[PDB]
């Protein structure tokens, strides 16, 4: 469900070995929202929020719409 | 531009003969959001809301984190 997702985000921070608070301020994000996404939430977060989280921990967040044969980019 | 991204979305909707008002009802999303997320405010868009919309256009929204060459899926 979201457990898989949660673990997809939890390890971005674990790899830098930073706490949830360190990151909220490294990415400039409410620690509440930071914790919510680490828990496989994400549906209630601005794309921006999510991007910052991932950028902060050295990744590139790519948002795409796949329709039929081809796909389109949003981020 | 993040306004060309969203204008690509406007055309997907239009090609399927749906007005913003219909799209709204279809994904149970406030019509106010759809106009903006169609005016290019993707960053500000709440993820699930943007999920809800892209599917009322018959699409899969696809969120992944690119690290090195390898990329990992969230949505």
Residue numbers in the entry:
A (entry chain B), B (entry chain A): 27 to 101
Question: What is the paper's account of this structure, in its own sentences?
Answer:
In the present study, we elucidated the crystal structure of Mycobacterium tuberculosis H37Rv HigA2 (hereafter referred to as MtHigA2), which contains an HTH motif. The HigA antitoxin represses the transcription of HigBA or forms a stable HigBA complex, thereby preventing the ribonuclease activity of the HigB toxin and the associated cytotoxic events. Structural studies of MtHigA2 confirmed that it has three regions: (i) a disordered N-terminus that is liable to cleavage, (ii) an α-helix bundle containing an HTH motif for DNA binding and (iii) a β-lid for dimerization. The antitoxin MtHigA2 has two binding partners: DNA and the toxin MtHigB2.
The crystal structure of MtHigA2 was determined from three distinct crystal forms. Form I belonged to space group P212121 and was determined to 2.0 Å resolution, form II packed in space group P43212 and was determined to 3.2 Å resolution, and form III was solved in space group P3121 to 3.4 Å resolution. However, the N-terminal ∼25 residues are unstructured in all three observed crystal forms. All dimers share the β-lid as their major dimeric interface, but the position of the α-helix bundle varies. When the different dimers are aligned based on a single HTH motif from one monomer, the corresponding motif in the dimer pair shows a different relative position. The flexibility in dimerization leads to drastic changes in the locations of positively charged residues on the HTH motif, including His54, Arg56 and Arg59. To predict the physiological dimer, each form was submitted to the PISA server to calculate the strength of the dimer interface. Interestingly, all of the forms had similarly favourable dissociation energies (ΔG): −14, −15 and −17 kcal mol−1 for forms I, II and III, respectively. This suggests that the flexibility of the β-lid does not impact the formation of a stable dimer and is likely to contribute to function. The three different crystal structures in our study reveal the flexibility in dimerization mode while anchored by the β-lid.
